[PDB]
Every structure is written in C-alpha cells, then in structure tokens.
Coordinates of C-alpha atoms and ligand atoms in Angstrom, one line a residue:
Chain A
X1 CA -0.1 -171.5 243.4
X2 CA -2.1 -170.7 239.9
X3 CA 0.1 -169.1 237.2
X4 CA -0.4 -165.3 235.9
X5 CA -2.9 -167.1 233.2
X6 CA -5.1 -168.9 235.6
X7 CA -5.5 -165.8 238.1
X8 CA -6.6 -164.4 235.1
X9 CA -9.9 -166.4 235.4
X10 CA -10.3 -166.5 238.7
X11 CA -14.2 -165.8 239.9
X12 CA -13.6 -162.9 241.9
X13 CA -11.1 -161.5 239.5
X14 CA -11.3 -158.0 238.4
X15 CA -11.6 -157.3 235.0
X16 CA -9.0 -154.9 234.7
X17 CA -6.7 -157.5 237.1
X18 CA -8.0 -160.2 233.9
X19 CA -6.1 -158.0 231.8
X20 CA -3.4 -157.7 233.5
X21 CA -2.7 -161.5 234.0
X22 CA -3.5 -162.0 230.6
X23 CA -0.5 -159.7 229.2
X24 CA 1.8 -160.7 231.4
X25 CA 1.1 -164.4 230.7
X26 CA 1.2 -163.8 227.1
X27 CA 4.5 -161.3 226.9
X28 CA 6.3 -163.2 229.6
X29 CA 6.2 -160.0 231.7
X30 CA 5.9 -159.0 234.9
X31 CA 8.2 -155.6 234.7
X32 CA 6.6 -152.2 235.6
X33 CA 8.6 -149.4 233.6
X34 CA 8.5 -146.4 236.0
X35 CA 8.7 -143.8 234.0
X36 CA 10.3 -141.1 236.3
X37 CA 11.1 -138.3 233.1
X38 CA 10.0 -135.0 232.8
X39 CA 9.7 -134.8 229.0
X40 CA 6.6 -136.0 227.3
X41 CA 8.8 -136.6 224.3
X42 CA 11.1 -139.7 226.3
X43 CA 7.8 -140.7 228.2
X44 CA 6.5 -141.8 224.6
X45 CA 9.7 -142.9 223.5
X46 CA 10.2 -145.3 226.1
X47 CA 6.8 -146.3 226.4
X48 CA 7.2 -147.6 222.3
X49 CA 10.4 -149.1 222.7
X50 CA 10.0 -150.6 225.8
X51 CA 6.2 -152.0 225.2
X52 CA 6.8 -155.1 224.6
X53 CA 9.4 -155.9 227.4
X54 CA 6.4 -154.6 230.4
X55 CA 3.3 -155.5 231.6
X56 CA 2.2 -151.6 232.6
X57 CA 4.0 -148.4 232.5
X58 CA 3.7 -146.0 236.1
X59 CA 3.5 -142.6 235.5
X60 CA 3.7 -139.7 237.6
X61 CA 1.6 -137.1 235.3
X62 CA 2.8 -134.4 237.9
X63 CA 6.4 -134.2 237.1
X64 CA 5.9 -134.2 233.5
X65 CA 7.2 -130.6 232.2
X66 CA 5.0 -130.5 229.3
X67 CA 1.6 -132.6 230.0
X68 CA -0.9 -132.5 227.9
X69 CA -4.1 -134.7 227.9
X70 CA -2.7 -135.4 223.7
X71 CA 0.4 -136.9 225.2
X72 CA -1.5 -139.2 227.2
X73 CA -3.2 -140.1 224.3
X74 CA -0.5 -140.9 222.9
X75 CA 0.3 -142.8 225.7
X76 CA -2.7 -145.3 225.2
X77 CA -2.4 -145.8 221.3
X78 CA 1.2 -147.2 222.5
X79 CA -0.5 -149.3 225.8
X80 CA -3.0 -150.2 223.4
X81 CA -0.2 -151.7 220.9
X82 CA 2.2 -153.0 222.9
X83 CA -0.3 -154.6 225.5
X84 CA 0.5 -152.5 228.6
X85 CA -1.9 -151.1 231.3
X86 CA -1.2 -147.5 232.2
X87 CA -0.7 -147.1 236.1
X88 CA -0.2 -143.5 237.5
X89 CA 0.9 -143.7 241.3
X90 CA -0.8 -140.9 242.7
X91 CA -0.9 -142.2 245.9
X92 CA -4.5 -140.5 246.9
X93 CA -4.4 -139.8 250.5
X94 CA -6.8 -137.3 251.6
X95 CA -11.0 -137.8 252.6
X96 CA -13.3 -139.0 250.2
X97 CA -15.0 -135.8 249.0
X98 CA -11.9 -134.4 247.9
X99 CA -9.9 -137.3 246.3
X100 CA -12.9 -137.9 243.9
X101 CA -12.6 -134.5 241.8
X102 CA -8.5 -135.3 242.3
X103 CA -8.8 -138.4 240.1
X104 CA -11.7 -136.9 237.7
X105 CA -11.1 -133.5 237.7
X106 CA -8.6 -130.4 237.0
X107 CA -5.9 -130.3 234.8
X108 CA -4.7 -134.4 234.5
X109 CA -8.3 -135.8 234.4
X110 CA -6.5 -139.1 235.6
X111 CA -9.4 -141.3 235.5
X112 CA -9.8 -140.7 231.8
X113 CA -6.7 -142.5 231.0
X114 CA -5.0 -144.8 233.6
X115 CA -6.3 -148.1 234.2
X116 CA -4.6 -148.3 237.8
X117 CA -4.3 -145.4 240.4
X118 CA -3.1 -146.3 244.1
X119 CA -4.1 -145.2 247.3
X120 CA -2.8 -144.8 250.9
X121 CA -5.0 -146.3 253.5
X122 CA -4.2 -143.9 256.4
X123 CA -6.9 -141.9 256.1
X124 CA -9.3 -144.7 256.9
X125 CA -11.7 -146.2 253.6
X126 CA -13.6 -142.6 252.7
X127 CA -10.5 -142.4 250.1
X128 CA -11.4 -146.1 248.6
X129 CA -15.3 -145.2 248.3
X130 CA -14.5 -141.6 246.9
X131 CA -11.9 -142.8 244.1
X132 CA -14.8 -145.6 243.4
X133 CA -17.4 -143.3 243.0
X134 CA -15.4 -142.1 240.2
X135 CA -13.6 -145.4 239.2
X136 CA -16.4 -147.7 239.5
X137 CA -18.5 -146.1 236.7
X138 CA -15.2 -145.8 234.7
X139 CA -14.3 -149.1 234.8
X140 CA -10.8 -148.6 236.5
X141 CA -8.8 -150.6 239.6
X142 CA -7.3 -149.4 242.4
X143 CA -4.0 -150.8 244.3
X144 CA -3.9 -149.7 248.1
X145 CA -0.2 -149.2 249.8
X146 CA 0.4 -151.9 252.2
X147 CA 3.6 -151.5 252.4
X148 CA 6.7 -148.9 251.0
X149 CA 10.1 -149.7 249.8
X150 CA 11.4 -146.1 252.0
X151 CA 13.6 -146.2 255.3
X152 CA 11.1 -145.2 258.2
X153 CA 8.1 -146.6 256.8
X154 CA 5.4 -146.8 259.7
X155 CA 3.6 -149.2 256.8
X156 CA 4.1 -152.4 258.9
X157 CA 2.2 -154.4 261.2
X158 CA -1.3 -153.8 262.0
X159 CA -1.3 -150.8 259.0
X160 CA -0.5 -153.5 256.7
X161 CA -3.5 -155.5 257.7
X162 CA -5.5 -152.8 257.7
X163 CA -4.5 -152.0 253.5
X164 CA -5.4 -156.1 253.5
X165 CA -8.5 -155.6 255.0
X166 CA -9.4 -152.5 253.3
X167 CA -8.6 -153.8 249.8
X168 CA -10.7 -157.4 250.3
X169 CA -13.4 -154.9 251.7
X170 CA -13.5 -152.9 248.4
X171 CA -13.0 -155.9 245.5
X172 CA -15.2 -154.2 243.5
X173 CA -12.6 -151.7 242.8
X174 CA -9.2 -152.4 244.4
X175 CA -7.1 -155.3 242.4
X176 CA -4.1 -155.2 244.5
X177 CA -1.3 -154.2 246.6
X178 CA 1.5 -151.6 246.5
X179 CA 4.0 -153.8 248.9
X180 CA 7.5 -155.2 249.7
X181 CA 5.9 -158.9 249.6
X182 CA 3.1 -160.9 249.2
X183 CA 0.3 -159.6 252.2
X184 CA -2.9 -161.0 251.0
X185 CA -3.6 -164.7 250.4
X186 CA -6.5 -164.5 248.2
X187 CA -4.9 -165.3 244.2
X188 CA -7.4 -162.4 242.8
X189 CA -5.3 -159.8 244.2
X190 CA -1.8 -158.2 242.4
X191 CA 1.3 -157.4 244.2
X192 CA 3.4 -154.7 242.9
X193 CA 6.9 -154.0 244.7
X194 CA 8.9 -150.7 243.9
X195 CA 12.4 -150.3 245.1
X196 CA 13.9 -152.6 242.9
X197 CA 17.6 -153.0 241.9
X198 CA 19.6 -156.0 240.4
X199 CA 22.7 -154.5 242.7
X200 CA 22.3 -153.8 246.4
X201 CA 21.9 -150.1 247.6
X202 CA 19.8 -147.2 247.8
X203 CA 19.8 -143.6 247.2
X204 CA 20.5 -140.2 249.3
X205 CA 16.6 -139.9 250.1
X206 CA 15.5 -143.2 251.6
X207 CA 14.9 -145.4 248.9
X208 CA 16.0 -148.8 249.4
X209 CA 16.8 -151.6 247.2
X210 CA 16.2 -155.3 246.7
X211 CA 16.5 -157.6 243.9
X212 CA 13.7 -159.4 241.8
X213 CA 14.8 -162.6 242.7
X214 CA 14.2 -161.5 246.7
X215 CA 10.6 -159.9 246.0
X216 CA 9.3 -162.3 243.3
X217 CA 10.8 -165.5 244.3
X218 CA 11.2 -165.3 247.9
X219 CA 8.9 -162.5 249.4
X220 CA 6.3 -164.0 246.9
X221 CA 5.3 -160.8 245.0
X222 CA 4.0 -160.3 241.6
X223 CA 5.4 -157.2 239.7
X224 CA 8.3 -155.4 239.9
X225 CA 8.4 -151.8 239.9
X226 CA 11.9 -150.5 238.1
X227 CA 12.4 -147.0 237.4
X228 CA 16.5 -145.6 238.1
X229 CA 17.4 -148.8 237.5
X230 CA 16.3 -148.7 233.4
X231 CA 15.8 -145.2 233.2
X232 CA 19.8 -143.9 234.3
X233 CA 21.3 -146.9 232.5
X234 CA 22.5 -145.9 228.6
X235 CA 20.7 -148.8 226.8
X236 CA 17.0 -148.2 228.5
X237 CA 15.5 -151.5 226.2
X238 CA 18.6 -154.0 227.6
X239 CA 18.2 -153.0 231.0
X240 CA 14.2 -153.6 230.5
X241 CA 15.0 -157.3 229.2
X242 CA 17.0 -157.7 232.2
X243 CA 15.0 -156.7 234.7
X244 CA 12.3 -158.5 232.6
X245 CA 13.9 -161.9 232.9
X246 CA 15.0 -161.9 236.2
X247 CA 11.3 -161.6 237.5
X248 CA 9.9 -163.7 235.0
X249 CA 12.1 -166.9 236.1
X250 CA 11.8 -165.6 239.8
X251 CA 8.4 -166.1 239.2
X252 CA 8.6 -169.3 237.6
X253 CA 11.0 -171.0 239.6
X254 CA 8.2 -170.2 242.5
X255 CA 5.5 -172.1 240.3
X256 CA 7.8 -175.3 240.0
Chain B
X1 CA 0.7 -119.9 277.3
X2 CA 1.6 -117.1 274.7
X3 CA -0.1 -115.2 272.0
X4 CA 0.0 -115.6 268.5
X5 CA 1.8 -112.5 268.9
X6 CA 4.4 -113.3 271.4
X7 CA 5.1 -117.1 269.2
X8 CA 5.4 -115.2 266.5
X9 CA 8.8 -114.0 268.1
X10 CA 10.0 -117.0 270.0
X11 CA 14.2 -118.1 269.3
X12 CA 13.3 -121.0 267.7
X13 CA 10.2 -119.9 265.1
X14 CA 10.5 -120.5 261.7
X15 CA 10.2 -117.1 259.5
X16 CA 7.0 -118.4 257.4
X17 CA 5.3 -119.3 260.9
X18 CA 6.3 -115.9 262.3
X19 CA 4.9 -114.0 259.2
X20 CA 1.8 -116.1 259.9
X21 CA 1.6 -115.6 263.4
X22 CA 1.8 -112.0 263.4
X23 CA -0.8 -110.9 260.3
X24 CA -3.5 -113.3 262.5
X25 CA -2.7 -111.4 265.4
X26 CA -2.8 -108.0 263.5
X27 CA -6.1 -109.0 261.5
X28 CA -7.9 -111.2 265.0
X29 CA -8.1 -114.5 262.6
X30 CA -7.1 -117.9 263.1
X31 CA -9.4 -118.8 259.9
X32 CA -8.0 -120.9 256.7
X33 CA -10.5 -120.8 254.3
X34 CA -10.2 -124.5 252.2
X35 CA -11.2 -122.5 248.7
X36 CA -12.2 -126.2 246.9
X37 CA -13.8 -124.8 243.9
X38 CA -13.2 -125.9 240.8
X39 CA -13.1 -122.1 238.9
X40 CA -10.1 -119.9 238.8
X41 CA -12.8 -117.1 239.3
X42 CA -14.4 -118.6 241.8
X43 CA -10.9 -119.0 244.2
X44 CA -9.9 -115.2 243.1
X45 CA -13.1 -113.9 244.1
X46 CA -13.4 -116.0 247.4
X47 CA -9.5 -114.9 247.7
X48 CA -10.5 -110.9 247.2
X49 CA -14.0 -110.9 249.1
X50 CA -13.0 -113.4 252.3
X51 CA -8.9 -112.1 252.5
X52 CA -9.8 -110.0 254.9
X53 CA -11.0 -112.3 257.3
X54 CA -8.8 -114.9 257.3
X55 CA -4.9 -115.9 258.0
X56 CA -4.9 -118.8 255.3
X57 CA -6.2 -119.8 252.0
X58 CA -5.9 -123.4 251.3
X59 CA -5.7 -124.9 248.2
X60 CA -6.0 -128.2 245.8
X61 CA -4.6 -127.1 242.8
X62 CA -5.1 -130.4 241.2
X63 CA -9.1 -129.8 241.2
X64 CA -8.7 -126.5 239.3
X65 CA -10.2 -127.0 235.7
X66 CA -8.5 -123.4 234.4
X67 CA -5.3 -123.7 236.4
X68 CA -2.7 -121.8 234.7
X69 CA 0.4 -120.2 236.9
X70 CA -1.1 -116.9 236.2
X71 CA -3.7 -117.7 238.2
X72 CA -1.4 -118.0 241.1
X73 CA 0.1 -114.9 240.2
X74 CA -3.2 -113.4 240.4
X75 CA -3.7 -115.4 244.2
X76 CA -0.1 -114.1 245.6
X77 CA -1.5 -110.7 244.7
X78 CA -4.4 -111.2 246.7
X79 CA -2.5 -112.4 249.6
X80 CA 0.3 -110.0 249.6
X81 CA -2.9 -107.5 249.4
X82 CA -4.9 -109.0 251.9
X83 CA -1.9 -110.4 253.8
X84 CA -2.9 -114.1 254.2
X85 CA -0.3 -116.8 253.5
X86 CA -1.1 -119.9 250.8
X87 CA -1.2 -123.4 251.9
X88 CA -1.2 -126.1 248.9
X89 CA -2.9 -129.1 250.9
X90 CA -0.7 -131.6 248.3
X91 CA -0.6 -134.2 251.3
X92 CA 3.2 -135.4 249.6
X93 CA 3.5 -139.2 250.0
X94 CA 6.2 -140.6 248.5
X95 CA 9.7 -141.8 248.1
X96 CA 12.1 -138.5 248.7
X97 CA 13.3 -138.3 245.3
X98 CA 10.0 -138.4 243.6
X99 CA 8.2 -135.6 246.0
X100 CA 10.9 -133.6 245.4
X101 CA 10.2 -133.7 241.5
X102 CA 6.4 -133.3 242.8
X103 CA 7.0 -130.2 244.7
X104 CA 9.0 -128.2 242.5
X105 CA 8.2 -129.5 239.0
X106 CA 5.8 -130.3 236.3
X107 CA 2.7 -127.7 235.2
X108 CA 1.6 -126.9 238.8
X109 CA 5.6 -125.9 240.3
X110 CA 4.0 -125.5 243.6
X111 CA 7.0 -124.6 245.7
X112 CA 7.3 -121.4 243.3
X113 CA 4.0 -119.9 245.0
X114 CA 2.7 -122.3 247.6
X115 CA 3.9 -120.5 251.5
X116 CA 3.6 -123.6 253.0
X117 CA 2.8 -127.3 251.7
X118 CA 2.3 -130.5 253.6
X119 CA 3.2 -134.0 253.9
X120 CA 2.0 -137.5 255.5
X121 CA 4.7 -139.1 257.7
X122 CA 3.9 -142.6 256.4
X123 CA 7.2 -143.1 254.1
X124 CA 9.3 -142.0 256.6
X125 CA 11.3 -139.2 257.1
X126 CA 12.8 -139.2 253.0
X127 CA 9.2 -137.4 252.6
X128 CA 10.7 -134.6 254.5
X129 CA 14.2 -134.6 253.3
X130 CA 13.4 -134.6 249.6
X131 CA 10.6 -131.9 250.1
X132 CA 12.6 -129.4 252.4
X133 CA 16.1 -129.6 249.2
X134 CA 13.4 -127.5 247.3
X135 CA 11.4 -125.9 250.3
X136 CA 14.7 -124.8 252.2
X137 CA 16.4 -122.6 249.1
X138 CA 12.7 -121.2 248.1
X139 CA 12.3 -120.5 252.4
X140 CA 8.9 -122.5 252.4
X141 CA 7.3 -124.0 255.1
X142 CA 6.0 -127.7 255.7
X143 CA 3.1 -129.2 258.0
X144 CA 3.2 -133.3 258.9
X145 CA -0.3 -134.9 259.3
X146 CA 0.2 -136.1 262.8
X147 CA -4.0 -136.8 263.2
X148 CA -6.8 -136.8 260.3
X149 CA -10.5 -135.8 260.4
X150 CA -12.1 -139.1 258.5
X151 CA -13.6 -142.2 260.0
X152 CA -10.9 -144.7 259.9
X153 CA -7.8 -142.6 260.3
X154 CA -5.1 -144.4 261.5
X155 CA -3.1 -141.8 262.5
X156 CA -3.1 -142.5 265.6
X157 CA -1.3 -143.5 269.0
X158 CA 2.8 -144.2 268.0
X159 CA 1.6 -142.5 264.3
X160 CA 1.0 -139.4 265.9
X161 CA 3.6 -139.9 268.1
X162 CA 5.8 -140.3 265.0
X163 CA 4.9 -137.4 263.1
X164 CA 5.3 -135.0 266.3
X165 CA 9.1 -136.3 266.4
X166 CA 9.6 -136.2 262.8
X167 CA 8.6 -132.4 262.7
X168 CA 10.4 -131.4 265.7
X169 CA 13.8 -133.2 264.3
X170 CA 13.3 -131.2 260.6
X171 CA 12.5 -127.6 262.3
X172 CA 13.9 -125.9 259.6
X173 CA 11.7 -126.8 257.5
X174 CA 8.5 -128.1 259.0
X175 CA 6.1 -125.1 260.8
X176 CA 3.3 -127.4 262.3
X177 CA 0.5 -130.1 261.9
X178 CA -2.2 -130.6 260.2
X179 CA -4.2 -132.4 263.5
X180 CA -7.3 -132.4 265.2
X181 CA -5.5 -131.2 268.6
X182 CA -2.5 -129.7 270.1
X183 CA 0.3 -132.7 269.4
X184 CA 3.1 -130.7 269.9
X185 CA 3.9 -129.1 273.3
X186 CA 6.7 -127.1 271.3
X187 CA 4.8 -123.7 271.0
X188 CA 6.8 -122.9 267.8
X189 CA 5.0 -125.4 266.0
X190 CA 1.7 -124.2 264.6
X191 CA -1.6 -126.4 264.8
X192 CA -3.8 -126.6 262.0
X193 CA -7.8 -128.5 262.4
X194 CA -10.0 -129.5 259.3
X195 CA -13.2 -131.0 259.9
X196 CA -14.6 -128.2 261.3
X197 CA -18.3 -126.6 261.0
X198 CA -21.0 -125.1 263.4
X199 CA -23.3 -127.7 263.1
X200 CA -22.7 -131.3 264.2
X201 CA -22.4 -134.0 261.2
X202 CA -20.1 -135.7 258.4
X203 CA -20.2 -136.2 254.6
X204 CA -20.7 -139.4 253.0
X205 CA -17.6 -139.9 252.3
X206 CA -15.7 -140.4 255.8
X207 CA -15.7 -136.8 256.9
X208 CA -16.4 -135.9 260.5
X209 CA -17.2 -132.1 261.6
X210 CA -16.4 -131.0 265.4
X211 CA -16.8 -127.2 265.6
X212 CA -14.7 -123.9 266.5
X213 CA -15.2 -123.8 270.0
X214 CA -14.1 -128.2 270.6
X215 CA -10.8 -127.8 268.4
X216 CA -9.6 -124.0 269.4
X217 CA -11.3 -124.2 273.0
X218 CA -10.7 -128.1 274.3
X219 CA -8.1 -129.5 271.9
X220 CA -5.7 -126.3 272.0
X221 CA -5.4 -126.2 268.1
X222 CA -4.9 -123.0 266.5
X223 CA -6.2 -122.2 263.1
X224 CA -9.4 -123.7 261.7
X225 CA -9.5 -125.0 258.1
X226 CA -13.3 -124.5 257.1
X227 CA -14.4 -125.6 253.4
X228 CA -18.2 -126.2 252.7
X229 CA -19.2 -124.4 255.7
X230 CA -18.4 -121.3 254.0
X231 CA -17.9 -122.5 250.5
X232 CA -21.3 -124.0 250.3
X233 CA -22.7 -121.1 251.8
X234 CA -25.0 -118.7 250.5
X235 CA -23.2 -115.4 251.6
X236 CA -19.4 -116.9 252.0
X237 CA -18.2 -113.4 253.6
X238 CA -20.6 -113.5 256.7
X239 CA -20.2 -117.3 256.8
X240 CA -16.0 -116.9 256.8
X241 CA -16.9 -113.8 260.0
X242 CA -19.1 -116.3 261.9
X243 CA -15.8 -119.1 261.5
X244 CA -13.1 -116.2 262.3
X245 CA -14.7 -115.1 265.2
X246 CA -15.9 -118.3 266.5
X247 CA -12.1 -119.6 266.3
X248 CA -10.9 -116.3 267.6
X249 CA -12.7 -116.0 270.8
X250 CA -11.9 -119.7 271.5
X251 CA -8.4 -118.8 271.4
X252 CA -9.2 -115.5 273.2
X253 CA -10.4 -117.6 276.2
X254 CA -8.0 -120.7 276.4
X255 CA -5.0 -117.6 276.8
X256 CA -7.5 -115.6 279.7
Ligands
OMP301 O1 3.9 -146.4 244.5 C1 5.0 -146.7 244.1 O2 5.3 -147.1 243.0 C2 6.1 -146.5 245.1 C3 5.9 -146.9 246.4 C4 7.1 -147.2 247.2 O3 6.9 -147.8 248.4 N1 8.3 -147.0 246.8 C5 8.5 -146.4 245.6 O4 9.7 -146.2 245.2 N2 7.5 -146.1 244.7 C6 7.7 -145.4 243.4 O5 8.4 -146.3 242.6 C7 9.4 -145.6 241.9 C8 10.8 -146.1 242.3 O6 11.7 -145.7 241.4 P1 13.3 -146.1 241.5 O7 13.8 -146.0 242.9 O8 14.0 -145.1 240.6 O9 13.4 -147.5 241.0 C9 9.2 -144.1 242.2 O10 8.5 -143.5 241.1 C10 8.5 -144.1 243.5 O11 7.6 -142.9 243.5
OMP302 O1 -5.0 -131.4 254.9 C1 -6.2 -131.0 255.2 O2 -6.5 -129.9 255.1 C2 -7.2 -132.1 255.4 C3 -6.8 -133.1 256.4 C4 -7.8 -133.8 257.0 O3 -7.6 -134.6 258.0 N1 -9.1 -133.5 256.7 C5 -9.5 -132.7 255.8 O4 -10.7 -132.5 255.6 N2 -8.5 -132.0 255.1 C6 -8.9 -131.1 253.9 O5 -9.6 -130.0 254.5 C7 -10.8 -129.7 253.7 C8 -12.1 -130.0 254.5 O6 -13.1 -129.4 253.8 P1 -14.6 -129.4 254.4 O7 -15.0 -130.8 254.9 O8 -15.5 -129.0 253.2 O9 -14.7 -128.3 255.5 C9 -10.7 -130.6 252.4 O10 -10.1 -129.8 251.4 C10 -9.8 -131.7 252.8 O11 -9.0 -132.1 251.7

C-alpha cells in the first residue's frame, strides 16, 4: 500500500487526484468538511477557519440561501490559501444531454468553480461522457457513487461493480469513489465515505453512522466525509481536529 | 381498464394526480412537453403557445440562465391559464436530510411552485421521507424512477421492482413513475415515458427514442414526456399536436 504522497505520482493518476494527495500528504489531512449551511456568510467562515484542518470542502450550492457566483469566489481565494479542493456533491443522475448544461450552465455554473462533482451510475455511462464533455476541457474530476451511507441503499452488489467498472472505464475524468469502503483496487483511484460519526447512531431520515477508524482503517477508505458531526457541535475548528486525527492515524496505522 | 377520467376519481388517488387526470381528459392530452431551453422567454413562450396542448410542462430549472422566482410566477400563471400542472424533473438523490434542504431551500425553492417533483429510489426510502416533510404540508406530488430511457440504465429487474414498492408504501405522497412502461398495476399511480419521438434513433449521449404509439399503445404508459422532438422543431405548436394526438389515440385504443 503506497502512502497519500506516492498515489500522488502514480502514472495513471489524475491531475486533479495529484493534487489531492499532495495536500493531504502535506496537511496531514484526509477530512472532507461538509459544509451543510445555508448562509454564504458561515460557508466562508468555516471554509477560513477550518482550511487548514481539510483536504476539500463539499458543498451543496443548492441549499445556500444567498448564492452568488462572488461567494464562490470567495470560496476559492480561501481553497486556494488553505490548500483545499472544492467538491460540490451534485450527485448528476439524469442522460447525458441534459447533465452537461446542469454542470456548465444556469444559475451555479458548477464547472467554473469545483474541482470535484459526483455522479450516480444508474442511468448507465451517457451521464459520465456528458459531464466530461464539459469537465474534460475544464480540467475537472469526477467521483461516481458506488456505494451510500443511507438505510435501503440498492447501491450493493453488482451496482457497485458496475460504478467500478464505469469509473476505470472513464479515467480520463473520474478520480474516485463516493463509497462505504474501499471498491476498486487500482491506487489511482480516491475513496470518499460520508456518514461519518465518532459516536454510533444515525438520524430520523436514514442516515447512518460509522466511525473513521471503521472506514479508514478497516473498510480501507481514503476520505472522510463529516458534516453534522463538525457543523452542530459549538467549537466547529476542535471538532475538525478531531475528526482530522482520527482518520489521519486510521490511515496510518493501515500503512504500518 | 379505466379512463383518465374515471382514475381521476378512484378512493385511493392522490389530489395532485386527480387534478391531472381530469384537465388531460377535459383537454384530450397525455403530452408533457420537456421545455429544456435555456431562456426564461423561451419556456414562457413555449408555456403560452403549446399550454393548450398539453397536461404537463417539465422543467430543469438548474439549466435556466435568467432564472429568477418571478419567472415561475409568470409559469404558474400560464398553467393556472392553460391548466397544465408543472413537473421539476430534479431527479432528488440523496441522504433524506439533505433533499429535503434541496427541495424546499436555496435560490430555486422548488416545492414553492413545482406540482410534482421526482426522485431516484437508489438511497433508499430516506429520499422519500425527507422529500414528502416538505411535499406533504405544501400538498405536492412525487414520481420514483422505477425504469430510465439511456443505454446502460440499471434500473432494472429487483430496481424496478423496488421502486414500484417504495411508491406504493409512500402513497401519500408519491403520484407515479417516471418509466418506460406500465410498472405499477395500481391504477392510481400515474405512468410517465421519456425517450420518446416519431422517428427511430438516440443522441450521442446515451439517449434512446421509442415513439407514441410503443410506450402509450404496447407498454401501457400514460403521458409522454417529448423534449427535442418539439423543442428542436421548427413550428413547436404543430410538432406538440402531432405528439398529443399521437399519445392520445394510443390511449384511445388500449381502453377500446
Ligand atoms: O455524496 C455524499 O457526500 C453523500 C453520499 C452518501 O452516501 N451519504 C451522504 O451522507 N452524503 C452526503 O454527505 C453529507 C453527510 O452529512 P452528515 O450526515 O451531516 O455527516 C450530506 O451532505 C450528504 O448529502
Ligand atoms: O425524468 C425524466 O424526464 C427523464 C428520465 C429518463 O429516463 N430519460 C429522460 O430523457 N428524462 C428527461 O426527459 C427529457 C428527454 O428529452 P428529449 O430526449 O429531448 O426528448 C430530458 O429533459 C431528460 O432529462
């Protein structure tokens, strides 16, 4: 197993996976903030204090009260000093055609500021070749869902092969893997797991929990994806360092 | 087998599928026009000229360079006018408590004007529950993606299977499918088709087309979603007639 900095040079690596592993090597990160508020104004204040605790910051542009494309400028000048990529989880899912003005075009023009979007594989590869159309040219990655963190997820099984296949398919573009665990065996490809807690539970609407130390160290993934877990606590930067250290020496402790 | 008409009335219909039921039985139009243009004057004036002939307009709001929320005010007038309902093809995808944020939140609040909305049964049914705490209150509708029209789909087999269950346990709250068939033998639960043109053929990007007569006629779907058959168009009224009637008399002739 090669560490974050070796991936990093990898022959088939991505550039913007490079990046990635670079950062995260050189922070001692692999914490992704997500960044569930609805005021620009705490987006940006978390994204400054939190920098240099993360690795990349997920947004979700569409529940943000008061987006402009200025605030995700903002956004950048702070990824851009704190060494962070910008991930928004739109989770594209519809045919080709249309998902390529979704990621260009109307009001978020996503594509002109997130390094990372995701996909859902379900509606075959047209949604991979139509977000690369756009991507490609842009110079942005793409993370397919392989797998989801909610109760009922039909993401198992042959579907999760098929995300694997689809991604290896597509390594021009897609860097990686929204997933519970590690699903593809080639180093070149990131795995980023969402519902993540340091204490067991869930919520009301599905969402389940596991710890870093379960996903990084023994389900073998990459990132962690925290959001409730920093965002609801009081001290937003402590709870960061936290989560922060717990997948940093998960990871390590895999390395030996 | 009953008419639009007669569904419209059954014990167990939902009130947006009733309202929808009856005004395509009053108007003889099982037509959803997918307006994908990128101009607020272009969807108004496709709204005003083709409201008429169809049951439906569908939307992506997200590829709308001018949106503003007085557009949509300007669109409910036309369907309140015209007496179509409005279907925001979002294709929701996540966790329950972020679609929930998604629906009713951030620039676009698409519960506020959207009739019905629709969601992929991949996360489970948290999709459904977080969507239908703002849907229920605002008395929306919801359609699960049971079957898709691109090359590659995987919703498929137990997928389908899946989706048809997940409706049918959440019936106050989810109206019907998006599919390329009759799913459902429920008659309460409305079946919309995409992919669907005259001629034979795809896009480049995964879409496949079957026409009017194979998805109203031989599948037993209901309503038609038609974009660049119409959209692309030269005259997009007579091309929206040719669709409504060709979807009508299939559905004239499967009742005999
Ligand atoms: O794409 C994701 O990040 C995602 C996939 C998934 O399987 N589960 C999942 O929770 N997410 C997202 O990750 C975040 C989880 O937030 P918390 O449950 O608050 O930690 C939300 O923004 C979800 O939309
Ligand atoms: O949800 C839908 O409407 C949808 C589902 C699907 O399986 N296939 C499909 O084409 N669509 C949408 O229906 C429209 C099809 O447009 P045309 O291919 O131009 O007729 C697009 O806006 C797609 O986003």
């Amino acid at each position: 197993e090669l560490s974050f900095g070796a991936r990093a040079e990898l022959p088939r690596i991505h550039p913007v996976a490079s990046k990635l592993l670079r950062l995260m090597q050189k922070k001692e990160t692999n914490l992704c903030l997500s960044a569930d508020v609805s005021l620009a104004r705490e987006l940006l204040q978390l994204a400054d204090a939190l920098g240099p605790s993360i690795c990349m910051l997920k947004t979700h542009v569409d529940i943000l009260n008061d987006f402009t494309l200025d605030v995700m400028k903002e956004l950048i000048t702070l990824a851009k000093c704190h060494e962070f990529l910008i991930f928004e989880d739109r989770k594209f899912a519809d045919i080709g055609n249309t998902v390529k003005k979704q990621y260009e075009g109307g009001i978020f023009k996503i594509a002109s500021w997130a390094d990372l979007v995701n996909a859902h594989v379900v509606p075959g590869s047209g949604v991979v070749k139509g977000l690369q159309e756009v991507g490609l040219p842009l110079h942005r990655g793409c993370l397919l869902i392989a797998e989801m963190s909610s109760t009922g997820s039909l993401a198992t099984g042959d579907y999760t092969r098929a995300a694997v296949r689809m991604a290896e398919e597509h390594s021009e573009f897609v860097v990686g893997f929204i997933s519970g665990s590690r699903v593809s065996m080639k180093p070149e490809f990131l795995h980023l797991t969402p519902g993540v807690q340091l204490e067991a539970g869930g919520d009301n609407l599905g969402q389940q929990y596991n710890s870093p130390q379960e996903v990084i160290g023994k389900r073998g993934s990459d990132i962690i994806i925290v959001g409730r877990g920093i965002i609801s606590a009081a001290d937003r930067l402590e709870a960061a360092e936290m989560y922060r250290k717990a997948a940093w020496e998960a990871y390590l402790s895999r390395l030996g």
